[PDB]
Structure formats: C-alpha cells, structure tokens
Amino acid sequence: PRKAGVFSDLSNQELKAVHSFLWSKKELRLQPSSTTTMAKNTVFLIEMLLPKKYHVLRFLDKGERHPVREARAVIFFGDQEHPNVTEFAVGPLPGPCYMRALSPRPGYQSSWASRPISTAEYALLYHTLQEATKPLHQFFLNTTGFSFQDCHDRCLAFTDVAPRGVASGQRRSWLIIQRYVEGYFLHPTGLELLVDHGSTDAGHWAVEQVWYNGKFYGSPEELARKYADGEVDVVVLEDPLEPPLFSSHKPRGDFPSPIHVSGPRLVQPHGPRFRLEGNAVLYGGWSFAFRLRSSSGLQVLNVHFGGERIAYEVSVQEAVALYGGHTPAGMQTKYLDVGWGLGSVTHELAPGIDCPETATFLDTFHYYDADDPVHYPRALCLFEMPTGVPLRRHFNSNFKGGFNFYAGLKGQVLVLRTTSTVYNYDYIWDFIFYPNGVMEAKMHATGYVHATFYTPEGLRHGTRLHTHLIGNIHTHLVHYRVDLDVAGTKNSFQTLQMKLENITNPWSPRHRVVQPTLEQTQYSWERQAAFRFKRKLPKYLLFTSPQENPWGHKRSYRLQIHSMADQVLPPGWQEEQAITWARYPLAVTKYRESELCSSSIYHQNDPWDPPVVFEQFLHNNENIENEDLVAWVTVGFLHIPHSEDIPNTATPGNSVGFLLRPFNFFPEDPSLASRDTVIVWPRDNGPNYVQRWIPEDRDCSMPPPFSYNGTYRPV
Amino acid sequence: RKAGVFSDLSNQELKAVHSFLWSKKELRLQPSSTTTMAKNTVFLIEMLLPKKYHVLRFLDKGERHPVREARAVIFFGDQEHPNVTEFAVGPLPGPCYMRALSPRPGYQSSWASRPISTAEYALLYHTLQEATKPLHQFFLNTTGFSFQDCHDRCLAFTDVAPRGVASGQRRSWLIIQRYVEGYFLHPTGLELLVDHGSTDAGHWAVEQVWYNGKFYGSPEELARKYADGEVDVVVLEPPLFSSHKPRGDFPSPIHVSGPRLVQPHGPRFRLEGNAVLYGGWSFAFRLRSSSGLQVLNVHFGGERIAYEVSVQEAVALYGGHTPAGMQTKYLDVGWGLGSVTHELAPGIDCPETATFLDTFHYYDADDPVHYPRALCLFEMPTGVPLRRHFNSNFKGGFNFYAGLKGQVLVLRTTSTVYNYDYIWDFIFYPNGVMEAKMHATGYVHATFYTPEGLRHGTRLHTHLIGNIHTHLVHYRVDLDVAGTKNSFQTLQMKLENITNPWSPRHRVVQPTLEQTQYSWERQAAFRFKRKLPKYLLFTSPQENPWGHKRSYRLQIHSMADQVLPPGWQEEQAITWARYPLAVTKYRESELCSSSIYHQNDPWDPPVVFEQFLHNNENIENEDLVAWVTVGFLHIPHSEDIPNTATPGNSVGFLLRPFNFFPEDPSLASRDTVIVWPRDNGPNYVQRWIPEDRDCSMPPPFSYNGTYRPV
Ligand SMILES: *[C@@H]1O[C@H](CO)[C@@H](O[C@@H]2O[C@H](CO)[C@@H](O[C@@H]3O[C@H](CO)[C@@H](O)[C@H](O)[C@@H]3O)[C@H](O)[C@H]2NC(C)=O)[C@H](O)[C@H]1NC(C)=O
Ligand SMILES: *[C@@H]1O[C@H](CO)[C@@H](O[C@@H]2O[C@H](CO)[C@@H](O)[C@H](O)[C@H]2NC(C)=O)[C@H](O)[C@H]1NC(C)=O
Ligand SMILES: *[C@@H]1O[C@H](CO)[C@@H](O[C@@H]2O[C@H](CO)[C@@H](O)[C@H](O)[C@H]2NC(C)=O)[C@H](O)[C@H]1NC(C)=O
Ligand SMILES: *[C@@H]1O[C@H](CO)[C@@H](O[C@@H]2O[C@H](CO)[C@@H](O)[C@H](O)[C@H]2NC(C)=O)[C@H](O)[C@H]1NC(C)=O
Ligand SMILES: *[C@@H]1O[C@H](CO)[C@@H](O[C@@H]2O[C@H](CO)[C@@H](O)[C@H](O)[C@H]2NC(C)=O)[C@H](O)[C@H]1NC(C)=O
Ligand SMILES: *[C@@H]1O[C@H](CO)[C@@H](O[C@@H]2O[C@H](CO)[C@@H](O)[C@H](O)[C@H]2NC(C)=O)[C@H](O)[C@H]1NC(C)=O
Ligand SMILES: N=C(N)c1ccc(/N=N/Nc2ccc(C(=N)N)cc2)cc1
Numbered sequence A: 001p002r003k004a005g006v007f008s009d010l011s012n013q014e015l016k017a018v019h020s021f022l023w024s025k026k027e028l029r030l031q032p033s034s035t036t037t038m039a040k041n042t043v044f045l046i047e048m049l050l051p052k053k054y055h056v057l058r059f060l061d062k063g064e065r066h067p068v069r070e071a072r073a074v075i076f077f078g079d080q081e082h083p084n085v086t087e088f089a090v091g092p093l094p095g096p097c098y099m100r101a102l103s104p105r106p107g108y109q110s111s112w113a114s115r116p117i118s119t120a121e122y123a124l125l126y127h128t129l130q131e132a133t134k135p136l137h138q139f140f141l142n143t144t145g146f147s148f149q150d151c152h153d154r155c156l157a158f159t160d161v162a163p164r165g166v167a168s169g170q171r172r173s174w175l176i177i178q179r180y181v182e183g184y185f186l187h188p189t190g191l192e193l194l195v196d197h198g199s200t201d202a203g204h205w206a207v208e209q210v211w212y213n214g215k216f217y218g219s220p221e222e223l224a225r226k227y228a229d230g231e232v233d234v235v236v237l238e239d240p241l242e243p244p245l246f247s248s249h250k251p252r253g254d255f256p257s258p259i260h261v262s263g264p265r266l267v268q269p270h271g272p273r274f275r276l277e278g279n280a281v282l283y284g285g286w287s288f289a290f291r292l293r294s295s296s297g298l299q300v301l302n303v304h305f306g307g308e309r310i311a312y313e314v315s316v317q318e319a320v321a322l323y324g325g326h327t328p329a330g331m332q333t334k335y336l337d338v339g340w341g342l343g344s345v346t347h348e349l350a351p352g353i354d355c356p357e358t359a360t361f362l363d364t365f366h367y368y369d370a371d372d373p374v375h376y377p378r379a380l381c382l383f384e385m386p387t388g389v390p391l392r393r394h395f396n397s398n399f400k401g402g403f404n405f406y407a408g409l410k411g412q413v414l415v416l417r418t419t420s421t422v423y424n425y426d427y428i429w430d431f432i433f434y435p436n437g438v439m440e441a442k443m444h445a446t447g448y449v450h451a452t453f454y455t456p457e458g459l460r461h462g463t464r465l466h467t468h469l470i471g472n473i474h475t476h477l478v479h480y481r482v483d484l485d486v487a488g489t490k491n492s493f494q495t496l497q498m499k500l501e502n503i504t505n506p507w508s509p510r511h512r513v514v515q516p517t518l519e520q521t522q523y524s525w526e527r528q529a530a531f532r533f534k535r536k537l538p539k540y541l542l543f544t545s546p547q548e549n550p551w552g553h554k555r556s557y558r559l560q561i562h563s564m565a566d567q568v569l570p571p572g573w574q575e576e577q578a579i580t581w582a583r584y585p586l587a588v589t590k591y592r593e594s595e596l597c598s599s600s601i602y603h604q605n606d607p608w609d610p611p612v613v614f615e616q617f618l619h620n621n622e623n624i625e626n627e628d629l630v631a632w633v634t635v636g637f638l639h640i641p642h643s644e645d646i647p648n649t650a651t652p653g654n655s656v657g658f659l660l661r662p663f664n665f666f667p668e669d670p671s672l673a674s675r676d677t678v679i680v681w682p683r684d685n686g687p688n689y690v691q692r693w694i695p696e697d698r699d700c701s702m703p704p705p706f707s708y709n710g711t712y713r714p715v
Numbered sequence B: 001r002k003a004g005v006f007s008d009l010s011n012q013e014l015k016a017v018h019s020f021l022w023s024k025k026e027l028r029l030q031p032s033s034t035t036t037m038a039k040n041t042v043f044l045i046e047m048l049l050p051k052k053y054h055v056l057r058f059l060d061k062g063e064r065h066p067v068r069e070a071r072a073v074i075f076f077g078d079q080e081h082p083n084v085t086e087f088a089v090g091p092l093p094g095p096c097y098m099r100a101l102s103p104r105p106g107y108q109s110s111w112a113s114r115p116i117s118t119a120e121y122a123l124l125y126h127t128l129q130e131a132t133k134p135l136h137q138f139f140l141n142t143t144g145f146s147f148q149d150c151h152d153r154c155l156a157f158t159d160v161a162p163r164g165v166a167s168g169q170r171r172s173w174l175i176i177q178r179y180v181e182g183y184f185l186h187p188t189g190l191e192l193l194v195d196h197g198s199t200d201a202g203h204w205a206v207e208q209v210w211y212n213g214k215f216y217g218s219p220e221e222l223a224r225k226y227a228d229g230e231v232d233v234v235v236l237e238p239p240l241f242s243s244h245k246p247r248g249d250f251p252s253p254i255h256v257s258g259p260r261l262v263q264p265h266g267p268r269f270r271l272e273g274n275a276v277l278y279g280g281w282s283f284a285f286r287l288r289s290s291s292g293l294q295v296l297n298v299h300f301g302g303e304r305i306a307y308e309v310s311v312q313e314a315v316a317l318y319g320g321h322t323p324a325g326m327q328t329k330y331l332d333v334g335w336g337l338g339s340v341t342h343e344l345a346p347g348i349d350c351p352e353t354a355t356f357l358d359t360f361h362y363y364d365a366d367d368p369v370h371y372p373r374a375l376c377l378f379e380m381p382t383g384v385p386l387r388r389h390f391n392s393n394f395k396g397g398f399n400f401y402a403g404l405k406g407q408v409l410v411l412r413t414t415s416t417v418y419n420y421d422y423i424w425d426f427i428f429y430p431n432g433v434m435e436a437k438m439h440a441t442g443y444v445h446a447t448f449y450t451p452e453g454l455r456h457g458t459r460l461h462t463h464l465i466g467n468i469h470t471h472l473v474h475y476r477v478d479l480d481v482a483g484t485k486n487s488f489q490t491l492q493m494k495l496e497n498i499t500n501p502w503s504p505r506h507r508v509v510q511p512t513l514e515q516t517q518y519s520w521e522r523q524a525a526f527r528f529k530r531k532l533p534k535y536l537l538f539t540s541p542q543e544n545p546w547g548h549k550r551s552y553r554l555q556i557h558s559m560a561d562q563v564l565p566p567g568w569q570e571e572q573a574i575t576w577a578r579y580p581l582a583v584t585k586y587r588e589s590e591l592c593s594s595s596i597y598h599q600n601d602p603w604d605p606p607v608v609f610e611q612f613l614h615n616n617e618n619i620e621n622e623d624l625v626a627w628v629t630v631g632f633l634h635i636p637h638s639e640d641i642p643n644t645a646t647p648g649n650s651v652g653f654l655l656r657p658f659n660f661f662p663e664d665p666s667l668a669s670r671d672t673v674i675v676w677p678r679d680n681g682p683n684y685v686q687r688w689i690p691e692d693r694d695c696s697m698p699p700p701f702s703y704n705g706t707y708r709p710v
C-alpha cells in the first residue's frame, strides 16, 4: 500500500515545500494571489505531476525503483511587457532542486487571455462596476431596491459568463446582474453588462455595452439618460427582504400523509469491510488507488480485480454546460469546468446527507488561486452501502408446492465519492465497485440552474420558472478517460452484434428458421473505433486480451454507456474546437504520454485555439491491434428547465455515466468467493437448514452526532 | 378503502368462485391434479377489473362501487372438440352468474394454444420413460444417469416453446438434463421432439431425436446406431459449478457482515389493504396472477398522474445450433408470470426492515394457494441526496449548506417461472418521480456444447453453451396527467445561426427549444429505427403559475432493438416489440398487449398490438395510453455461471413531473437540513425533525419455502 503513494496527491507539507522553492527564486518576483493587481507574477496552481506510465509500471510490476515525485506549478507572469502563463515541473519531492518547463506551447500568443479568472480579478471587476455604474445608481434603487455603491445587506452582485469574447486573445465578459439574496443565482435584475478586462491595468477596463430588459444601450450613461427621460420600459422588482424565499431550501407546503420521523438509516457495527490506507483501497476482489487532481477531478488508478489489472486509469476529464439564450449573456454561455478548478471545489460533505453517516470521510489540500495550501474538510468519502437488490438470487421450485433450495447473495456496493461546486451547480462524482468485478462511473447533477431575466423572447430558449426568471436550455456533457489495461497493457477492441440468419428448418424441411446468430467485428485502426453520435453504437463494446479463459474465449471487459447525449455544436465551428471529444460517445486511441488529457485549464477562456484538440488524437489513424489502448467516453443530457427545478435541480433521473463489466474475463462469477451467500435447504419432516458462511448479524451501533464546519483555510 | 376496487381476490373469494363453478354439475369439473388431458378443469381464477368509466365515477364522482367479478378460465377437454373458454363470474360476494368472454369466430386452435400444466408434465415424463427404454444402456454409459430406477441419478427435461411450426400444433422439443443442483446447466446432448396434441396421452410420440449434432428419427434408431458403433458419443469435494456455494479466495477476504438498514421508528408509509400512502404519494396495487404487478390510481399531492402502470409481457428470444435452442421464444405470461411470486428472503431479496406481504393465487391448482412474502414494500436510502448545495462565500467560508437525504419507496415482487428470476420494482421518490424497473438474475437457458454452437452463443463450461438471446418486456402506462384528457408532445434542441446582436461581424450559433405536437396515433408510434426525442411529454391543458402546460415526462432506460422481422410468423405474437414507445387512445377492448395464449399460438394470437394502431385515431385531448418496450441483448459469458447477476442487468423507465408542480414538490419534506454560519460562534444546524441516532434489531431470519392451500 506504500506503492499506491506514487499516485497520491501532494500533502500540505509538499505543497509548502514547492511553494517555498518557488518563492526562494527572487528573479520570479512572486506576489500573493490575493494582491489586487493583474500586473503581478503569482503561482496560480500546484498539484502532483504523475510520472510516465512506463516507469510506474516497472515500479509496480517489475520491482524497479520508485519514480521521481514532482509537482506541476502554473505561474501567471503578469509583471512584464508581454504577460503570459508558463508551467513548470518542480522536483524532486522531497527536496525540490529544479523547475523544468512543462507543456510548452511555443508560437502561441494568447496564453494571458486564456488564463482562469481569479479572486483578485473578481475584486477588481467589482471596483470597475461600482465606478462604471454610478450613472445608474438611482435607476438601481428605483428598479431593484439594491445597489453597487454604499450597500450593506442590499447589494447587487454579478455572475460572469464564459467564454469571454468572439476570438482568441480577447477577455470581454458578459455579466448578469443579480440581487444578492439567499439563492441569489435565481434573482436576475434584467441588466447585463459587457466588460473588457484584458489589460493588466484595471484602470483601462471599461463597460463597453449594456443590455436591459430586451434592448442594447451602449453605455451606462445612455441607459441612465433614457431612463431619466422616461423612455425605458422598466421592470420594478418587489422587495425580497414570513414564507421562505422561492430560492430558499426551507420547507414549505404539506404532504397529505404526514412524515414526522427520520427514515431508515445504515448501521455499520462491524466497521468498514474495505481496507483504506492512504490512497489505497482493498475491497474483496478489488484493489485500487485514487487521487483528486485539483485541475480535473477524481481518478482511480491501477485498478485490479482478483490480483489482475483491469484499468490503469479512469478519470474525469471535462464537464461542460452549453447554453442558448434570448439575452447576450445567455447566448454567450459555454461553461468548461476544468477552467475553474473542477477538482478544487470539493466542498464539505455533510454526514448522513451527502454520504451515509457510516462513511469514511477524507480531508484534502488544494493550492488553487490561494496564498497558501488550503485545507478542505470531508472533500471525499468512501462507503459500503446495501443496494437494496440482491447481487444474485434463485428460488429452485420443486413444482409440487415446495422447493429444492433458495440461494441469494445480499447486494452491497463500495462507493468512492467527491463533489464539485464551482458556482451554482453541485456535481456529485461517484466511482462504484460491485463485488462481482463490475465498476461504474456516475455523475449526478444538483444545485441551482443558470438562469436569466424573463422576457417573452426567452421562451424560444428556455422555460419561465418564476415571475422574472427563465431557465435557459442547455446540454450537460462530461468526458471520461478510461485507460483499460485488460489483464495487462496490450489489448484489442471488438464489438458483438446479433444478426439474423434464415435457414431451412433442419427437422421440418418445408419450413424456415429465422433466428439470431452472434456476429463479431474486429477493429484495426483508430478511425474505425471512433463512434459518432449519428453512427449506430453496438450493444457489446469489448476490450480484449489475447489470453483465453478456460472455455476458449478471450478475456475481455465490456463498456456500457448510460447517456442521453447527442451532437450539440456543429463540428468544426468556432468554439467547438474546444470540445471535439463531444463528437464521440466512444473513441479508442493508442496510449501516448503527450495525450494524457482531453481538456485543460485554458480551454474555457480560449476555446477557439486550445492547447489540446481531441480530434487530433485520431488524425494519425493508428493501428490498435495488440496495443496499449485508451477508451474515451462522452456522457450527458439535454436539460430543458422546468418549474420543479426551483429552487434546485434534483438527482433522481439526473445521472449519467458508464459500467465496466467482465466478459469471459473470469472462469465463472467472481463474486462466488463472497461468504455472505445464503442457501436455504428443505429437510424432510423438519424446519429448513439455513446454510451460511458468516453468522447472522443483528448487532447495533450509533454514528457520531452530526457536525458541519463550512470553512476551508490554510493549516 | 376505495383502493379495494383494484384488489386481488382473497382466499375466501377464490374458494367462493371455485365452489360456485363446482356446484354446476354439467361442467363435469375435475381437479387440476387428475392425470388426464381429457377433463374439464378450472385453470385460473383472478379478479376481473371493472370498466374505467365506472371506476372513475366511483372514485371521483361518489357513485356506486362497481360490481366485483372474477375471470375464470376453463379447460374443456372432456368433449369431442376440446376448447378453452373464459367466463366472468360474479357478483362478489355471493356469485350467481357465469358469463362467457371474448368469442373468436373461425379460430380453431384454442386447445393447442392453452398453457402447459403440472398434469401434462407428469404425462410427458411417463411418455419419455416409456419411449426412451431402448436408450437405457446409452444413458448409463454416456451420463451415468437414466429415467428408470434412477433415484439420486435421474435425468430430467426442460421443455421449450413455442410447440411446432404452425397454429394448432403441440409438438415440443425437450432438452434432456442431469437432475443435480442447478440442473439447468447440465444438458446431456440429447433433445427429443414429442407430439402431445391428443387428449389421449396414449397417442403421444417421440417423433424425432437429436444427439450431439445429428438427427436420429427414433430412440430405437439411436440405440441401434450406438450399439453398432455409429455414434459420436460424449461421455460426461469442491462445489458443483452450477451451485451458489462459495469457492475461491478474494485477495482481501471479508469475514464479517456488511452494513444494514435499521428502522427504529417504523415505516414512514401507510399500508391499508392494497392502499399505500407515502409523503405526497397515494396509490393502490395488485398482483395479477396472469400478467404480474400493477400500480393503479397513482396520485401525488392529491392529483392523479396515472390510472394504471402494469407489466404486460416478458419475452426471451433465442438463437441456437440445437433444435431446442433454435425453437425457443419464451413468452412468460403464457406461464402465469404473476403466479410465480415465490418467497422473498428477508435481508437478501428485500431489506430486513421491509414489510412483506402474502398473497393467494389460483393458477393450475386444486385449491387456492398461499404464497408467503410474495411482495414487499420498503423505504431505503439511495445513498445520494435528493438535492444539496454548498453556497460558498468564495472567501474561505459559506453562506449555507442545504441538503435533503435521499430516500425511495420500493414496491417489489419477483417471478421465477423456471430458470430465471425477474425482480419487478415500482419505485417512488419524494419529489414525484416514479420509476419502473426489472432486474434479471437466476440461471441462463443453456444447451449442449458443440463447435457449431459458437455461432449462436458462448461456451460457458465443458459441455455448456449459453445461447444468444434478447429479453424484451412490455409495460402499459395509462397516464391520466391531472385528469383523463391529455395530449402528447416532444421537445428537441435545434440550433439557430444568427447575427451576433452586439458584434454584427460575427455569428451566434446556439440552442433553441423546438416543440412538436402529435395529432394521430401513427405519428406517436416510434419504431426502433426512428430517432426517439429526448423529451417525451404527456400534457394537460391546465397550466402551472408560470404559464407552461402541466406535464409528466417519460424517460426510457433500455438497450432493446428490433429482434424478429416485422410480419414474419411468430413475430405476430410480439408486434409491440416494434415500438419502444407507442401512444394509443384508451379502449376497453385494448387493455392488454398479450395473453396467456400467445406462448403456444404465436402465429395466430387473440391480441395483435399493431392492430391497435390500424384505425389511427386522433390523440389531441383524449384518454391516452403509453406503451413502453424495454429490453436488452444478452450474449452469455462465463461470469453468468452459476447465475446471471443484477448489476447492469436492469431496464425500465422513469415518469418525471414537468411543469406539473409550481416548484420542487419535495419542499414539503421536513427531513431537509440547512447549516448556517454564525458570528463568532458554532454554526446553526436548522432542522424540522430532530436528529436521530437510534438503532434497533430486525426480526431474526426465517424462510419457509412452501406454498400451499390454507
Ligand atoms: C513568458 O514569461 C516568462 C517570464 O517572463 C519568460 O521566460 C523568461 O524569458 C526571459 C527572456 O527570454 C529570460 O530572461 C533573461 O533574459 C536575459 C536577456 O539578456 C538573459 O540573458 C538571461 O539569462 C535570462 O534568460 C528568463 O530567464 C525567463 N524566465 C523564466 C522563469 O524562465 C517566457 O519566455 C515567456 N514566454 C513566452 C512564450 O514568451
Ligand atoms: C426466408 O427465406 C425464405 C426462402 O428463401 C423466404 O421464403 C420465400 O419467400 C417468398 C415470398 O417473398 C415466397 O414466394 C417463396 O415461396 C418462399 N420460399 C420458401 C422456400 O418458403 C422467406 O421469405 C424468408 N423470410 C425472411 C423473414 O427473410
Ligand atoms: C471549523 O474548524 C476549525 C478548525 O478546527 C475550527 O477552528 C477552531 O475553533 C475552535 C473554537 O471552538 C478552537 O478551539 C480552535 O483553536 C480553532 N482552530 C483553528 C485552527 O482555527 C472552527 O471553530 C470550526 N468552525 C465552525 C463554525 O464550526
Ligand atoms: C367450447 O366448449 C364449451 C363447453 O363445452 C362450449 O360451451 C357450450 O356451448 C353450448 C352450445 O353452444 C351451450 O349450450 C353450453 O351452455 C355451453 N357451455 C358452457 C359451460 O358455456 C362452447 O360452444 C365451445 N366454444 C367454442 C368457441 O366452440
Ligand atoms: C452561419 O451563417 C453564416 C452566414 O451565412 C455562415 O458564414 C458564411 O459562410 C460562408 C461560407 O463559409 C462565407 O463565405 C461567408 O462569408 C460567411 N458569412 C458571414 C456573414 O460570416 C456560417 O458558416 C454559418 N455557420 C454554421 C455553423 O452554420
Ligand atoms: C411453513 O409454513 C407452515 C404453515 O405455518 C408450517 O406448518 C405448520 O407447522 C406447525 C408446527 O409444526 C404445525 O403445527 C402446523 O400444523 C403447520 N401449519 C399448517 C397450516 O400447516 C411449516 O412448518 C413451515 N415449514 C417450514 C419448513 O418452515
Ligand atoms: N459552471 C461554471 N463553470 C461557472 C458558472 C458560473 C460562474 N460564475 N461565477 N461568478 C462569480 C462571480 C463572483 C465571484 C466572487 N465574488 N468571487 C465568484 C464567481 C462561474 C463558473
């Protein structure tokens, strides 16, 4: 379990050591992230940098030395004539000595414009709006009762929209103005503002355009004039500050059948049946390591069942929400969450609500837009839960009023979970491990919708959810990397289909038999295994090893996709360059260290010219017979908002993902080693014999009282 | 309870119908168990639901309880021209009439169409025992088992349906097996075709024999060829591979029990008879002996959503290298899908905290039969919150955390006809979402291994091929969204390409919302070839407060496709499987998509779903019925030994409110917890129900395993 350490995230200590090394280089002229100027040099992100697979596998499988441990460090060089973002690999860990260039992109000139927004930048944007919108102060008070200047409890706020412009190198953002109340996401005022914030001198930033209640106005001063002159159709909003606010989670209404007591709960008197130690997990047949990459999110690594490898890596790669709208902000919105630190917004899981009270909760540290490493309490959880359906069961009737036996194995599953709450939405990320060698990836969407001011024109792009509220139509798309190494690194890909044959009936020659046969298709080249949404996706998608099981069949794992995704943007059109992976529910590539990721932190703010274009991995149409293969999976769903999304979208029916299932991999059902199986046998003239291999449990235990902290701070 | 109008017959009611019929001396009734096909016998008795018109007047307009009746299916085999006829028997209590149902003028295959029975199997065994006598030494040498003086080493058979090549035939391929633990997986390589059409079992014959890839004409011919050395013969303590007994070792052994649910405060749903209340939900249920589980009169928040959600048919369609294998198209309603609801094991099949319900069935029995723990009803945590939000202040703290623990109510039964166990769930979420689900487990339908079999299946063991097949299930979904009169619409996203209104040299290419209305049945019959829209909506004319039509959305979870060619022979029995979704106008003559007769006369069955669309009726503002096909291709693999497992082996659908309620309907729940920060103190944890950490023990495990008259 020390070996799983090669995959582990950086400790608080290691993050400090990397940060100190960087700070000791006086030439870098580094300032804290919190300093309120853009014209500074700052370390924006530090996270572990995974060593090459070749070296990790020699360490894991051939006894060779532990590879060098390094950190990725992203530095924003804003304090120079030509600002840029540059990345370094810092190592070794422990004892950093060097910083070497990482992911260089020579000849590209928009790296500064491509960079993620930061807390300092938001502060400066607030200052720009407080100044720029002075002409509108009375307009604000009259229409909303709230303001930007001299406010305390009745403040206007903004939600920014990305991407930020119409071409590579621009940083011009539409801002949706809202009333800062409980669940403020759902309180747009009808004003939206376009701000050019490209310059490293915030004094140059300007509101370049204004939209209010269906019209463009050019400047805050023009809107103020036209309002002063009685030429603006305004919407005066009611005061929001007994009954709860519509955007609140507070209970209201009554069910016809009163529920006064707590529902049923899990108890775990015997404690966990999995072994978690550091970032290593053992659970029955399973063995795996996990990590939480600050940039991109949850990964499980080096996944084995029964002592044989199934997958080197299964990871979240990108999460997108692609909008339409009647408002300029709405029509602009294409959120790419890795551009916001999808793996860094792993906020505190509430025991008994977010995970069972019996779960193991784990803390982590992130360094993402921070002055020091920040402690995130209960960022992850791991728990076993009964599924409520048996893994297998059979009643073997004697067809004479009794039975020969009943057999069953109670359903349990191991769940590794984190969340991501970048702003309005909360995504719940699960990897799930069944005792029979089946593993599942799942995402559940909850939290608040991205919403805009209601006008009649909005109904072509959304649904009216409240008096002044439209839920814009959009699609959620998530990309997973699935580096299966089925029984080893060298695999092939094949599909199975049912095809009818029409033959003479062998026992009645005047007749025909029209019946299913089993058809196998082999794939030799990447392009053949790149399935577009328009193409028919076969029902059996197999990743095979050349090794056979005892019955002469190739040992395989099967991929099963659960999605309602489809092609959203036209292939090849503008921002679609950033999400070319979304063309493919499934694509298979040959492994390469230069293609470890389908997205990046830079994609959100330069979608026109990003550093990774997934389609390019298919350009060379490589041979994929007996190679190290990587499956890439797109799952998703169209979300047309509806009134039941108020105040939050709920999880039921709102999940997507995929299963990996053994297919001729094992000689028989690998759950057979479980001792939880029960078989009941009849006895002549007596009570039945209940055969067990583990004693019946009726024991009891209690969880600790509920607590919740809510803060995340350096330690 | 008004829900009683939907309830199954009690033990008392079944006896009353049975006594009444037996008091009619001219029916010449004999018990199901009598060992002859030349008898008249009552095969099935179940409740016959009254017409929807009368039920809704009773429920909604305070009118009289409808007349309660039974369906009685009588096999008239003790006459020159045997047939099956069905009767409405009533009223209940105190039956005094017997009215014949559903005549079919010109149809001549009634008798052949009828289900198989225990007495018929007993006669088939006798036939095999006599007919295979010449093969006695062949059996002993090749298998060590036989049909005669065999004791603990007996051969058995698995029959296959349908039974012939045309309407009116009763000619069955029988797969010979060794009768050991999990005998399903022990084929010997012999298959026999028996003609058992005659009501005189003395006339039944083995008309054909297949052994290890060759046809042999008769048992006598196979015996002589064996003796003459002209047959390629296959001659056949850890647990048996077909046993569920544990073997092997995990790398990290588990020696203790896993987590379990406790319910110290009792159920949070109310069950009274067949009526359920849970949060916003009210509904009734029944277990129809012929066709299985139904939920009826489903309300959320005092408003109707569905009049009926019911299992209609469950099919498994095979290909194979052996005659039995290539013959097999199982239709489970022809075997009493709702009658094989065998005992649920507490803690394994349902949680130990579940409420288990008994039922009575009269299906191929001498008297009504008590089935213990036939169904269960339980609430369980889903392990994922129904909703949650962390409202960051983006400065190292929070404004609040809000969450609602996930719970669902599950109504469950099973069906084990023979080898497979189907687990049928209807699931109710606190936010007005209900789900139907079926999970497959148990033993696969398997045949004897030869190399030629690998074109139709997978080798699973030394002598065993798992044959390729598709499972298909049909559901009837009679949604009455806020009322009987509904329309059907779909929503799609479509891109527009416009001038960027704030940068005119550029374009905005973006999503718009496109609505499609449907006027005629045929427009709403979606074939597997056709693209299924992402939003399938059943709509009321009533609007919510935001001016959008109150609707429920259907979301299908399936891997099904077109299996048999439309129009070809047995496909006539499963025309519904052309459509993942079809929408019809409600009619009393179209309550079911299948029947107990479809299995044994699939060429000319009494209900052809496609015909329901022939008149292509208007579906604007009508009583609509949605019909849903879900299923999956199952290519067997070695992990299916000894049994297929449930993970990833489930299909079904969701019904989700869509602009039906003004806001999230779960907001009435008092389980919600909100955590608020406080100046210079601990956070305030706001609750509307006290925190509970109590634990209790469930009942100790018991299992009976018998199902008998009481
Ligand atoms: C992005 O910005 C970084 C940091 O400003 C650039 O790297 C820096 O490049 C400069 C000039 O090429 C190096 O500065 C010094 O230049 C003098 C020239 O007289 C030379 O004699 C010194 O030896 C030294 O190289 C500087 O070392 C280097 N800084 C770091 C931390 O590597 C980077 O080139 C910019 N990227 C792009 C693509 O423009
Ligand atoms: C399976 O093949 C058979 C034989 O080719 C087809 O049966 C023939 O169909 C045509 C009608 O289109 C008849 O005129 C012939 O008399 C039939 N021949 C025989 C030998 O029966 C049959 O249509 C095919 N079925 C399918 C579903 O493909
Ligand atoms: C959240 O967690 C922090 C860290 O444990 C708590 O900070 C502690 O506050 C208590 C006061 O009860 C002191 O005893 C400790 O010295 C504090 N430690 C640090 C490192 O600050 C904090 O109180 C918790 N906040 C809430 C709202 O529950
Ligand atoms: C099926 O057989 C039944 C019972 O033998 C027939 O029903 C009888 O029909 C005769 C003459 O039509 C009536 O006088 C009897 O009263 C009927 N008996 C009962 C119990 O209903 C019936 O005609 C046959 N059905 C068909 C389609 O031939
Ligand atoms: C959206 O519409 C615009 C305008 O019709 C299309 O852009 C034109 O494309 C042609 C051929 O590529 C060019 O020669 C014209 O100069 C373009 N016109 C303008 C005004 O830009 C555009 O291709 C369409 N985009 C999509 C994805 O359909
Ligand atoms: C299964 O259930 C039946 C019904 O309760 C049990 O039979 C009863 O057993 C008691 C105790 O011996 C007898 O006194 C009664 O006469 C039986 N009642 C009836 C109605 O038959 C039976 O023992 C149970 N079987 C098993 C194996 O647990
Ligand atoms: N899903 C997303 N990527 C996403 C959606 C909306 C969004 N808007 N954020 N706006 C936003 C505005 C101000 C602050 C601040 N005071 N620190 C923080 C965030 C940011 C990201």
Ligand SMILES: N=C(N)c1ccc(/N=N/Nc2ccc(C(=N)N)cc2)cc1
Binding pocket: A399, B118, B121, B157, B158, B159, B160, B316, B330, B331, B332, B335, B417, B418, B419, B420
């Ligand atoms: N899925 C099905 N419908 C189905 C599958 C297989 C099947 N075969 N049954 N064989 C079978 C044989 C003998 C008996 C008897 N001794 N009573 C009962 C059943 C019957 C039905």
Ligand SMILES: [Ca+2]
Binding pocket: A526, A589, A590, A617, A618, A619, A620, A621, A622
């Ligand atoms: Ca390639």
Ligand SMILES: [Ca+2]
Binding pocket: A312, A483, A484, A485, A486, A489, A591, A628, A629, A630
């Ligand atoms: Ca690989």
Ligand SMILES: [Ca+2]
Binding pocket: B521, B584, B585, B612, B613, B614, B615, B616, B617
């Ligand atoms: Ca019709």
Ligand SMILES: [Ca+2]
Binding pocket: B307, B478, B479, B480, B484, B586, B623, B624, B625
């Ligand atoms: Ca209806």
Ligand SMILES: [Cu+2]
Binding pocket: A445, A449, A474, A476, A639, A649
């Ligand atoms: Cu959404």
Ligand SMILES: [Cu+2]
Binding pocket: B440, B444, B469, B471, B634, B644
């Ligand atoms: Cu199957």
